């Protein structure tokens, strides 16, 4: 079902401290080395007036390199697919609340991406637009109330050298009823912009994820 060089087609809709945008997306990726890269551009709301980092993160753990001792609930669920939900709780108040829902179709992966935030504080880092990259990460997988959820400490560095911090929390679910919880693990992420354009309308997005038991 899921081989090793798949697609990906992607569209977010969007609402950030009142300003309404779509953006869709087109990638490749290799499942089982959790590597991932996406072609992204605005196609409403341009050009965004807030930081383009608060949003990758929700442009998918189908692609995380999953060793044999840790079960893979994300290439479990297909071909019904899966969803998730997710929290940003930023440092200074600014909050995101993101949903996708994953889907495929033959060698493509389709992701229906919902992203609102609010609260960002009109000269904070990401209504001024100085972020510049988010931190390597290691997601924490667990069981909380018989749901498979993630946590995450994130920081995103900024122009100066400041950290921004931010708390995420995701819960996964499978499309369809018996799919078995995995046990808990970790996952490490990288993500990196490799290129835009001036207005952040076009992005070249890259995404490394790997699971492990330590």
Known sequence: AIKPDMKIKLRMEGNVNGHHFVIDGEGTGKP??????MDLEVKEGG???FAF?????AFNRVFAKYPDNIQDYFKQSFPKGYSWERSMTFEDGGI???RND???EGDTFYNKVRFYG??????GPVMQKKTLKWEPSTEKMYVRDGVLTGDIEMALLLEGGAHYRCDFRTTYKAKEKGVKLP???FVDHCIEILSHDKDYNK????????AHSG
Do not use: R, W
């Open 102 to 104: 994953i889907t495929m």
């Open 118 to 123: 609010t609260n960002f504080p009109a000269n």
């Open 32 to 37: 089982f080395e959790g590597k991932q890269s």
């Open 203 to 210: 992005v070249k997005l890259y995404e490394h994820a790997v």
């Open 183 to 185: 046990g808990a693990h």
């Open 53 to 57: 980092d608060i949003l990758t993160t």
């Open 47 to 49: 050009p965004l007036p």
């Open 96 to 98: 995101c609340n993101a």
